[PDB]
């Protein structure tokens, strides 16, 4: 069995989970404050950068 191993044949579902997670994060980053209207003392770096 160890010699045979596994090939992960066409793990499309894993890619779907990857896309779902990536699709989630883009929303998380978009949730946070953008530089369009900042109201901090000085223009600091943001996680989007």
């Amino acid at each position: 069995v160890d010699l045979l191993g596994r090939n992960k044949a066409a793990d499309e579902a894993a890619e779907r989970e990857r896309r779902e997670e990536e699709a989630y994060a883009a929303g998380v980053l978009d949730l946070m404050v953008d530089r369009e209207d900042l109201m901090d003392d000085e223009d600091h770096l943001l996680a989007q950068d």
Binding site: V33, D41, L45
Partner: protein, 1109 residues
């Protein structure tokens, strides 16, 4: 030092061996090289170069000669010559021209079949030049090209560890920068694979055989490393020809495999200068790394036969573990792994090379059609003009100066901002890194910044680390490697043999500190000296091991950072904040040099170019508020125009005033006029104010600042702000809109300040909503409603065909009109297509300090002005002097910026002269003070150079030797504290408080530009939501987090009313407005557009979405 040089006693103890070089040399030398100026030629040949070639000449030689496919004709270019500039800087800036000069090149055409020769001068066009300040005048704007930071092409060696089954793999990738890829990598199978063109792993022996190697020679020479023996064993190729055929088959199997084409492709791939080049810096890097063909100059732009074998041999040595290597025909070199962050690998693309790249692209685009015109025309009827089109090159150079990221508007906020901007090292742009990439890997401070890139001063925005500044002592190597000077040390004695070394050149030596004590002769007085090793680590070594020494303590800081006194006492973060804040100081109406500063105030002022310096010795003929006339010793008159009340790019007023009088002798280089933020030639960004460190009734709570009303009354912190309003009149499909004094449907009182032609008179005062220039547009269809028809019948005012569109003063702005500029097609002005007239009006205002304006020092201490007390309220010294500013005590120790307290103490010591009791003998603390610094009068200015400033003990001793005041008493005791009376109650404060003089500056973050408000205004065209991004009627963003907060509060009704009524609910919004104005209660909100639009869209996708109860 310099002719003027106002007396400023310094606290320095060390001696400066090398004067600070021209701060603006980076921006000027590159361009001098590009245009091949005579002085550049003299400097290059004197350095040890023979027949040096300029950038333009280099590009022309690379392009020329060009031969047609038939091979019967040839075209060549040579001898580029420049002409006088079309106009002056001032004229170009006034008329929105471009400061450029005609460029000419000698073109020659040769007919091979016959022998006809045609030589002529072709007009290349207007080459944008630059002024003496390293700026380009593009369309009447001062743009700056910031040097870019890129990875120098060459051969690099790396080693990684496999994360699957341990063990390590070494690889070498060759980056040419203008051609394909060629790398050799080691796998975990005891082999050495070569992946040509990053396609697929191949045996190295295959490449060796292809070049013309055989098994016998391989087994005779590469007999050191066993891995390559295994690779040769695995190799199946027998002869050299098969290797070429095998490589050709593996590369492109589709095409037929033939020996001739197989060799030709590989020959074409890397061994041709027309497809694969190293840009003449990769060759130098490979020569320095491998060590081949050392000594003799090299012009080849390809890989030498020995280079590939040497690289492979070096790779196997590195895997083997040999720390040294040498090959016949070269010099022995060490073996190690290279990193991408190291400046022996990161070069600098200055303005000259940046322009050269675009010129090369333009010339290639031109040549593409030059050869076509050769192949399409008839012979014996062709001249250089008939096959040379200058349109593409001009278009390319124009596009680079108006769209390229590297070229951007020069920060004209103050002289220091411009000076720092010019000498900036950006790590992004075309061919650089993205703003959303390289996190905490390329923006970290590498141990190689020391002496070549300031490690403390850098923007805190998105570009942290990516953008930095060049150090004080640094000049770019002709190749493009930043090199720094060092003092030669031999046999433990420091000598005057300054040598400029690069990072890699420095990694082979041991450099010591500049403050290390030395004997009078020059020998080292101590035994163990602190030095830097080859790995960027600090270690104590023997005095004999010292190889080099730093030129001065402030060899790592930049110009901006060197202006911060007591920088060694401030934390790194606070120092960064202060350095970046010093570039945001608005020029004040009356500037004043700091009482306490460094030695960089003078130079930074002169090099910034914001002052006028006499060109040659002479006598001031006359002085006026507009110009200065000086008569030189040779009888040649010189006249300097003084740009007066000139608007800077950022809105600050930029003006100069003379500081000389008639009959005054002036030497060359002496400052005769001073700029916006300069006094007597020294930079004066801020003001010296009397500061008391103490909390005050909570008005300075949380970094807030309390100010005295005196600053307002005496214009201590007042500034001039100028804004430009522009409007055009153009032709329209309904007719040409005209500017006119007459305006419809408006009273005659509002336009009482308009002139004959409908423009506001100069000198008039304007507030928001005032008409600056009348303007009307054709309207068209009227179709008046019956209400309007009756209303205008009773009044009798007939319909007007035109609609009012006059320019209005934006809300919140006021001032006086100081200038008007008018352009028109009637007078042949170069207006854009369809535009008939253009009007610009300048409004200037006198902005005083007010609550909420940011205010900060040089040590990162920042705060808004929370209150401005009257004079009588502020705490006052026993002699009756009221303190000008109060800074909260709680904020100093936490922020870890104790340097501001030292600045305060030394400023007090400088304001009131000091006198050490040296009559009986120098005290112990004063034994280190220079002879000149034992006694000084009142209002003296002292210098405390960074890392070589006044020691804490010396300052403490000086505090106890201050002179008395007019009454004859000392206000501040030996501890730096003084008693203060309460201005409100009159009782003296229970304990003494720190009082002194601090240098503080007004930042551009004013309240007037940071106040917004909306009730009802413009709405978006598509989303129907209020639009933003502008300070007139921009709306605020209500994010999802605020929605979560509202939901947590349980505030259902507020969330609904805020998401629908106040945004994209057209039906209910007008009803809400009507209810508010009528006094009726607000109706219940409807359904937002964001839902009806969603419903219609989702229905459009053949989805039967329906609602039900």
């Amino acid at each position: 030092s310099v002719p003027g040089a106002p007396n400023r006693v310094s606290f320095a103890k060390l001696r400066e061996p090398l004067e600070v070089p021209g701060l603006l040399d980076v921006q000027t030398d590159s361009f001098e090289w590009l245009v091949g100026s005579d002085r550049w030629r003299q400097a290059a040949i004197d350095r040890g170069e023979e027949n040096p070639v300029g950038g333009l000449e280099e590009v022309l030689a690379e392009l020329s000669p060009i031969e047609d496919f038939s091979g019967s004709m040839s075209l060549s270019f040579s001898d580029p010559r420049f002409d006088e500039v079309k106009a002056s800087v001032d004229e170009c800036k006034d008329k929105d021209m471009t400061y450029a000069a005609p460029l000419f090149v000698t073109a020659e055409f040769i007919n091979n079949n016959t022998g006809e020769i045609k030589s002529q001068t072709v007009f290349m066009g207007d080459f944008p030049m630059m002024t003496e300040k390293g700026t380009f005048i593009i369309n009447g704007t001062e743009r700056v090209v910031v040097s870019q930071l890129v990875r120098s092409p060459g051969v690099y060696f790396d080693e990684t560890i496999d994360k699957s089954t341990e063990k390590t793999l070494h690889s070498v990738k060759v980056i040419p920068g203008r051609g394909a890829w060629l790398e050799f990598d080691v796998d975990k199978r005891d082999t050495v694979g070569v992946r040509i063109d990053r396609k697929r792993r191949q045996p190295v022996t295959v490449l060796l055989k292809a070049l013309g190697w055989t098994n016998e020679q391989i087994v005779e020479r590469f007999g050191f490393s066993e891995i390559m023996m295994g690779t040769l064993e695995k190799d199946t190729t027998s002869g050299t020809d098969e290797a070429l055929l095998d490589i050709y088959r593996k590369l492109r199997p589709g095409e037929p495999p033939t020996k001739e084409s197989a060799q030709t492709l590989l020959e074409n791939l890397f061994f041709k200068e027309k497809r694969y080049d190293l840009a003449r810096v990769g060759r130098y890097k490979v020569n320095k790394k491998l060590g081949l063909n050392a000594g003799k100059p090299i012009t080849s732009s390809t890989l030498t036969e020995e280079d590939v074998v040497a690289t492979i041999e070096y790779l196997v040595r590195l895997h083997e573990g040999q720390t040294s290597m040498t090959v016949p025909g070269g010099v022995e070199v060490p073996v190690e792994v290279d990193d991408i962050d190291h400046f022996g690998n990161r070069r600098l693309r200055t303005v000259g090379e940046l322009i050269q790249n675009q010129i090369r692209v333009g010339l290639s685009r031109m040549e593409r059609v030059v050869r076509e015109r050769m192949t399409t025309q008839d012979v014996e009827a062709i001249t250089p003009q008939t096959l040379i089109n200058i349109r593409p090159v001009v278009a390319a150079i124009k596009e680079f100066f108006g769209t390229s990221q590297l070229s951007q508007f020069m920060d004209q906020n103050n002289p220091l901002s411009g000076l720092t901007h010019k000498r900036r090292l950006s790590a992004l742009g075309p061919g650089g890194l993205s703003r959303e990439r390289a996190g905490l890997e390329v923006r970290d401070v590498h141990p190689s910044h020391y002496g070549r890139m300031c490690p403390i001063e850098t923007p805190e925005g998105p570009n942290i680390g990516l953008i930095g500044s060049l150090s004080v002592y640094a000049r770019v190597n002709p190749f493009g490697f930043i090199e720094t000077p060092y003092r030669k040390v031999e046999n433990g004695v420091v000598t005057d043999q300054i040598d400029y070394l690069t990072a890699d050149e420095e990694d082979r030596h041991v450099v010591a500190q500049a403050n290390s004590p030395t004997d009078e002769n020059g020998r080292f007085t101590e035994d163990r000296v602190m030095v830097r090793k080859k790995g960027g680590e600090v270690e104590f070594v023997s005095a004999d091991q010292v190889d080099y020494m730093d030129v001065s303590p402030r060899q790592m800081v930049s110009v901006a950072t060197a202006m911060i006194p007591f920088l060694e006492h401030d934390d790194a973060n606070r120092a960064l904040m202060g350095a970046n804040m010093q570039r945001q100081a608005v020029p004040l109406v009356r500037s004043e040099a700091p009482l306490v500063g460094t030695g960089m105030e003078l130079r930074a002022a002169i090099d910034a170019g914001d002052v006028v310096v006499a060109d040659k010795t002479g006598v001031i003929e006359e002085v006026s508020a507009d110009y200065i006339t000086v008569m030189a010793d040779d009888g040649t008159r010189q006249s300097y125009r003084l740009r007066k009340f000139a608007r800077s790019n950022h809105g600050t007023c930029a003006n100069q005033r003379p500081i000389v009088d008639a009959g005054q002798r002036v030497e060359a280089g002496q400052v005769i006029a001073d700029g916006p933020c300069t006094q007597n030639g020294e930079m004066a960004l801020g003001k010296n104010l009397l500061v008391a460190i103490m909390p005050w009734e909570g008005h300075n709570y949380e970094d807030a600042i309390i100010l005295s009303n005196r600053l307002v009354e005496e214009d201590v912190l007042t500034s001039i702000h100028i804004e430009e309003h522009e409007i055009d009149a153009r032709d329209t499909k309904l007719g040409a809109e005209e500017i006119t004094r007459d305006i419809p449907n408006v009273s005659d009182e509002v336009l009482a300040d308009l002139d004959e032609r409908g423009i506001v008179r100069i000198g008039a005062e304007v507030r928001d909503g005032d008409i600056l220039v009348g303007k009307v547009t054709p309207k068209g269809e009227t179709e008046l409603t019956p209400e309007e028809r009756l209303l205008r019948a009773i009044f009798g005012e007939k319909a007007r065909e035109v609609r009012d569109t006059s320019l209005k003063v934006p809300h919140g702005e006021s001032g006086k009109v100081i200038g008007i500029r008018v352009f028109s097609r009637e007078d042949d002005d170069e207006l854009p297509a369809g535009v008939n007239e253009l009007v610009r009006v300048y409004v200037a205002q006198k902005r005083k300090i007010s609550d909420g304006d940011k205010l900060a020092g040089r040590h990162g201490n920042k705060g808004v002005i929370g209150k401005i007390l009257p004079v009588e309220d502020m705490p006052f010294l026993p002699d009756g002097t009221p303190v000008d500013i109060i800074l909260n005590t709680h904020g100093v120790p936490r922020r870890m910026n104790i340097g501001q307290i030292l600045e305060t103490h030394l400023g007090w010591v400088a304001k009131a002269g000091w006198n050490i009791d040296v009559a009986a003998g120098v005290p112990d603390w004063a034994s280190k003070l220079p002879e000149e610094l034992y006694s000084a009068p009142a209002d003296s200015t002292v210098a405390t150079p960074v890392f070589d400033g006044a020691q804490e003990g010396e300052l403490a001793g000086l505090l106890g030797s201050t002179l008395p005041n007019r009454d004859g008493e000392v206000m501040v005791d030996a501890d730096g504290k003084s008693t203060l009376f309460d201005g409100r109650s009159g009782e003296p404060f229970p304990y003494p408080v720190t009082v002194g003089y601090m240098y503080i500056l007004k930042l551009h973050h004013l309240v007037d530009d940071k106040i917004h408000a909306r009730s009802t205004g413009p709405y978006s065209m598509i989303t129907q939501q209020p639009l933003g991004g502008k300070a007139q009627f921009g709306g605020q963003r209500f994010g999802e987090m605020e929605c979560w907060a509202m939901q947590a509060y349980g505030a259902a009704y507020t969330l609904q009313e805020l998401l629908t009524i106040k945004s994209d609910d057209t039906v209910g919004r007008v009803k809400v407005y009507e209810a508010i104005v009528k006094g009726e209660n607000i109706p219940e909100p409807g359904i937002p557009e964001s839902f009806k639009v969603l419903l219609k869209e989702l229905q459009s996708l053949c989805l039967n979405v329906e609602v039900l109860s």
